[PDB]
Design a protein around this ligand. Structure first.
Ligand SMILES: NCc1ccnc(N)c1
Ligand SMILES: NCc1ccnc(N)c1
Lengths: 133, 133
């Protein structure tokens, strides 16, 4: 089968199993893929989305260790454009509307989030060893 | 170059960049390796070492996403023995003494820990957004 270029993007702050499963899902959308992962900038993430603990460099360095990741664009653009897909020869965007154009182009592929497995969920579990009273 | 079987073991609780760098180091000890990673049991870790947030199954599932990991033994034995090295055809043990026999056998390879990159370090950074006064 021909190689298919998949693009996923995100913050990837305090990388956890939920991120890695979503990256696995994107990587496995077809038999033979290149998974490019875009990591959002510190300034744009904080302005448009919310707070981020780790710097772009830290978030990117951690992602390089994930086996599903073939290429990283860091920083990535905050908004995906058709020209961006042309520049990097991206066939499909893997995502969990602003995205109507992607669906009309046949380039939108859904991925799922996993609940209850985040890094902050783990800290909440640590805290339960300390009773309120 | 002939394939070399490397064994590393650990708790791998709330997997972070420091773990992944140490696994990368073990994987890259020689040109061609198989990196087997042993994950310690919940009961033995808590008895002999200290507290663990994630279950063996969770710690193991997260490790499978790391690109350096070729095989996982989960649970692994708490203490490595010469018979264990024979059973899994392990050439070297990558570790950061109880381990004198490994050094005498020529099978001890040192790896390093990275400071300041742990999951709990990140939570400490979150807390600094809240002044004492
Ligand atoms: N590894 C690429 C990258 C991303 C962000 N900041 C850097 N200094 C480098
Ligand atoms: N994936 C192996 C494994 C380790 C611990 N517990 C399980 N149920 C399974």
């Amino acid at each position: 089968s021909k190689n298919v270029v998949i693009y996923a993007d995100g913050v990837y702050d305090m990388l956890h199993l939920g991120h890695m499963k979503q990256l696995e899902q994107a990587k496995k959308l077809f038999e033979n893929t290149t998974l490019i992962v875009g990591v959002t900038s510190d300034n744009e993430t904080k302005l448009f989305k919310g707070q981020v603990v780790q710097t772009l460099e830290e978030r990117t360095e951690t992602l390089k260790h994930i086996r599903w990741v073939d290429e990283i664009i860091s920083p990535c653009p905050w908004v995906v454009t058709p020209e961006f897909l042309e520049k990097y020869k991206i066939d499909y965007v893997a995502h969990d509307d602003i995205y109507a154009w992607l669906k009309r182009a046949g380039k939108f592929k859904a991925t799922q989030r996993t609940e209850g497995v985040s890094t902050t969920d783990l800290i909440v579990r640590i805290l339960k060893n300390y009773e309120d009273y």
